[PDB]
Enzyme design. Structure first.
Site, PDB file in Angstrom:
ATOM      1  N   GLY A 110       3.154   5.640  10.210  1.00 10.00           N
ATOM      2  CA  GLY A 110       4.508   5.513   9.720  1.00 10.00           C
ATOM      3  C   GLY A 110       5.198   4.243  10.145  1.00 10.00           C
ATOM      4  CG  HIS A 151      -0.376   0.134   2.538  1.00  4.24           C
ATOM      5  ND1 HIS A 151       0.211   1.286   3.017  1.00  4.24           N
ATOM      6  CD2 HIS A 151      -0.337  -0.759   3.558  1.00  4.24           C
ATOM      7  CE1 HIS A 151       0.646   1.078   4.251  1.00  4.24           C
ATOM      8  NE2 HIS A 151       0.315  -0.150   4.608  1.00  4.24           N
ATOM      9  CB  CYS A 190       3.121   0.596   7.269  1.00  4.67           C
ATOM     10  SG  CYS A 190       1.508   0.841   7.935  1.00  4.67           S
TER      11      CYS A 190
HETATM   12  C1  LIG Z   1       1.227   2.609   8.109  1.00  7.42           C
HETATM   13  O1  LIG Z   1       2.327   3.342   8.646  1.00  7.42           O
HETATM   14  C2  LIG Z   1      -0.052   2.761   8.933  1.00  7.42           C
HETATM   15  C3  LIG Z   1       0.125   2.219  10.352  1.00  7.42           C
HETATM   16  C4  LIG Z   1      -1.155   2.416  11.165  1.00  7.42           C
HETATM   17  C5  LIG Z   1      -1.436   3.883  11.470  1.00  7.42           C
HETATM   18  C6  LIG Z   1      -1.937   3.884  12.912  1.00  7.42           C
HETATM   19  N1  LIG Z   1      -1.432   2.648  13.479  1.00  7.42           N
HETATM   20  C7  LIG Z   1      -1.067   1.790  12.532  1.00  7.42           C
HETATM   21  O2  LIG Z   1      -0.723   0.634  12.715  1.00  7.42           O
HETATM   22  N2  LIG Z   1      -1.111   2.008   8.275  1.00  7.42           N
HETATM   23  C8  LIG Z   1      -2.165   2.691   7.831  1.00  7.42           C
HETATM   24  O3  LIG Z   1      -2.291   3.882   8.077  1.00  7.42           O
HETATM   25  C9  LIG Z   1      -3.205   1.962   7.031  1.00  7.42           C
HETATM   26  C10 LIG Z   1      -3.198   2.494   5.597  1.00  7.42           C
HETATM   27  C11 LIG Z   1      -3.407   1.413   4.533  1.00  7.42           C
HETATM   28  C12 LIG Z   1      -4.235   1.992   3.386  1.00  7.42           C
HETATM   29  C13 LIG Z   1      -4.460   0.950   2.294  1.00  7.42           C
HETATM   30  C14 LIG Z   1      -5.121  -0.282   2.887  1.00  7.42           C
HETATM   31  C15 LIG Z   1      -4.318  -0.884   4.032  1.00  7.42           C
HETATM   32  C16 LIG Z   1      -4.088   0.173   5.105  1.00  7.42           C
HETATM   33  N3  LIG Z   1      -4.516   2.220   7.597  1.00  7.42           N
HETATM   34  C17 LIG Z   1      -4.796   1.933   8.862  1.00  7.42           C
HETATM   35  O4  LIG Z   1      -4.115   1.194   9.566  1.00  7.42           O
HETATM   36  C18 LIG Z   1      -6.067   2.548   9.356  1.00  7.42           C
HETATM   37  N4  LIG Z   1      -6.971   1.456   9.526  1.00  7.42           N
HETATM   38  C19 LIG Z   1      -7.970   1.343   8.685  1.00  7.42           C
HETATM   39  O5  LIG Z   1      -8.180   2.106   7.749  1.00  7.42           O
HETATM   40  O6  LIG Z   1      -8.867   0.245   8.906  1.00  7.42           O
HETATM   41  C20 LIG Z   1     -10.111   0.319   8.228  1.00  7.42           C
HETATM   42  C21 LIG Z   1     -10.611  -1.104   8.145  1.00  7.42           C
HETATM   43  C22 LIG Z   1      -9.788  -1.729   7.026  1.00  7.42           C
HETATM   44  C23 LIG Z   1      -9.507  -2.094   8.482  1.00  7.42           C
HETATM   45  C24 LIG Z   1      -5.969   3.351  10.654  1.00  7.42           C
HETATM   46  C25 LIG Z   1      -4.895   4.429  10.512  1.00  7.42           C
HETATM   47  O7  LIG Z   1      -7.250   3.964  10.893  1.00  7.42           O
HETATM   48  C26 LIG Z   1      -7.835   3.833  12.203  1.00  7.42           C
HETATM   49  C27 LIG Z   1      -6.853   4.183  13.316  1.00  7.42           C
HETATM   50  C28 LIG Z   1      -8.338   2.412  12.403  1.00  7.42           C
HETATM   51  C29 LIG Z   1      -9.004   4.804  12.307  1.00  7.42           C
END
Ligand SMILES: *[C@H](O)[C@H](C[C@@H]1CCNC1=O)NC(=O)[C@H](CC1CCCCC1)NC(=O)[C@@H](NC(=O)OCC1CC1)[C@@H](C)OC(C)(C)C
Ligand SMILES: *[C@H](O)[C@H](C[C@@H]1CCNC1=O)NC(=O)[C@H](CC1CCCCC1)NC(=O)[C@@H](NC(=O)OCC1CC1)[C@@H](C)OC(C)(C)C
Lengths: 306, 306
Positions: A143, A41, A145
């Site tokens: 960040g 991603h 990820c």
């Molecule tokens: C990467 O650095 C990041 C790490 C997360 C941020 C906060 N804590 C983490 O572990 N990952 C992300 O931001 C992903 C982004 C990608 C986009 C493409 C698809 C895969 C994920 N997104 C998240 O982890 C969000 N979760 C989410 O969107 O879940 C929705 C349902 C599909 C599960 C987080 C940032 O959002 C919330 C904190 C859950 C609101």
């Protein structure tokens, strides 16, 4: 003496962390030999989050779109390929710090050390378990990820986790290093929830053995139990079923402490039914389930890594 | 999201661990530049444990009595000197892996990462606090002496602990890297006990802020409290007194969460008086006191290390 949630020494992995920037997305990558592994991603944008076709997205990329920083040295991407949900960026420089390593897909109940990283710089190390529902109760911010989870065996780093996302419950989902999500999760922003978790029974028992090795005995009892009658109780308290294979694995710990596995099960049974009544085990007021039987033997015996 | 007992990445310290053997004693040493630091009781034998005169014992040593192994490379001792309870073995080779580093004597309540080692090989990393009674609740077996505790600040390893001994209660005592024991302990086998410990109040409050940052609010309340009336309650439950300096240090966390420090004190007061009533905070059923306010801000904000 003492019993701690112990992570593996992280230096062999620290030497592999790199920053991968593509577009407006920065995350971590794992640099082994001349390949940088990172969550696919990274090729997504703020509108691309929702239902992306990553094969479409990736053919529109050029190698120079991938900015790989190894500390203060820019790595040049000379090729890229997607394997499941991981992107493999071929770089022109082999990581001289590449440890001996394996990629392993672990079973739920198995523990690992997470080297939390931001911008390719390690921030911290902690021990996690893969929960039965294939999430991990991590500590991850924006960040993180691409941070990886790993075990070390003598000199070999077995990478088992790469971090991708946080679920709405605050637990974390990711992949093995070959890009296959643990659990039902997909890397696209849709309704995804963890699914009900259960307590890793065999690990709780291991930790009860850790307690006895370390001098807590207050929870032991006269009673024994059958595996079925234990599992009927585990059942009720949302505990993972204990298998005969689990029992066998708990063999050495049973042999070291002289406490038959099913005797320890009888003890856990009464712990589940009586609570702990204001007492603690190994400094915990909860039954701890993120130590495997291997974890206990390693820390209560002193296994190291060269 | 998530909150874990996070250790610092240990690689900068792994690169400094060495095995020191003298006579029948093997333990770990810390190799920084051309000096190997290790507990001076390495110069003791099985009868020498009891009431040793280390100045006597050391003048009877020759440099070639000190067998220093850096992995599979024998380091030659070219000189030795004793500084308090640490032996400083001068070697003919500067550690090329020497990080930027400081030696710091920490205050009780301060946390650190311990890189547990055996035979100069790192076994595990975990976070400890220096208890108010100047012991640490470590995880240490025979041969772990010389394992160090440390913090990392950007690129600099602040070594603060070197492991020397286990007390009869199973807690651990050691020195700073200049050989001064933390607490009343001495490196000689005599009646020594830890002395009554207390809970690190300011750390508990920090962790309560960690909980709020991470979405646990069930323990907050309407009430506030004065610092005196809080301390009168802390008093009863064997909690370290909370000082105004502690309050100030909790400032940023109070500012980030919008919860006045004394409001959080009112919440801790009711936690102490009501228990948690079957609830958990950050996955704990006990009030956790081994996160400093710095620890919480670092992990809830993402500070890293290059
Ligand atoms: C990467 O650095 C990041 C790490 C997360 C941020 C906060 N804590 C983490 O572990 N990952 C992300 O931001 C992903 C982004 C990608 C986009 C493409 C698809 C895969 C994920 N997104 C998240 O982890 C969000 N979760 C989410 O969107 O879940 C929705 C349902 C599909 C599960 C987080 C940032 O959002 C919330 C904190 C859950 C609101
Ligand atoms: C060094 O590798 C080793 C580490 C400890 C072994 C078990 N866990 C440890 O942390 N340290 C020791 O074995 C020291 C030996 C020296 C001898 C010279 C004086 C300083 C200590 N000894 C111990 O830690 C023992 N503790 C002890 O003797 O305490 C007696 C009172 C003075 C405190 C341990 C091994 O014995 C018990 C486990 C406490 C029975």
């Amino acid at each position: 003496s003492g019993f701690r949630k112990m992570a593996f020494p992280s230096g062999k992995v620290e030497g592999c962390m790199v920053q991968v920037t593509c577009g407006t997305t920065t995350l971590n990558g794992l640099w082994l030999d001349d390949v940088v592994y990172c969550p696919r991603h990274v090729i997504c944008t703020s509108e691309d989050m929702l239902n992306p076709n990553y094969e479409d997205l990736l053919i529109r990329k050029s190698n120079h779109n991938f900015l790989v920083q190894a500390g203060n040295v820019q790595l040049r991407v000379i090729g890229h390929s997607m394997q499941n949900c991981v992107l493999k960026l071929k770089v022109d420089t082999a990581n001289p710090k590449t440890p001996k390593y394996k990629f392993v897909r672990i079973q739920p109940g198995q523990t690992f050390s997470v080297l939390a990283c931001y911008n390719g710089s390690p921030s911290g190390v902690y021990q996690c378990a893969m929960r039965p529902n294939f999430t991990i109760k991590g500590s991850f911010l924006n960040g993180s990820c691409g941070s990886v989870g790993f075990n070390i065996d003598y000199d070999c780093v077995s990478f088992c986790y790469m971090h991708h996302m946080e679920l709405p419950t605050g637990v974390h989902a990711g992949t093995d290093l070959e890009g296959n999500f643990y659990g039902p999760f997909v890397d696209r922003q849709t309704a995804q929830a963890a699914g009900t978790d259960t307590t890793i029974t065999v690990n709780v028992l291991a930790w009860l053995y850790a307690a006895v090795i370390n001098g807590d005995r207050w929870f032991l009892n006269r009673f024994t139990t059958t595996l079925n009658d234990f599992n009927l109780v585990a059942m009720k308290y949302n505990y993972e079923p204990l298998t005969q294979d689990h029992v066998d694995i708990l063999g050495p710990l049973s042999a070291q402490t002289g406490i038959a596995v099913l005797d320890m099960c009888a003890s856990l049974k009464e712990l589940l039914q009586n609570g702990m009544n204001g007492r603690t085990i190994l400094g915990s007021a909860l039954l701890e389930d993120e130590f495997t039987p291997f974890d206990v033997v390693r820390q209560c015996s002193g296994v190291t890594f060269q």
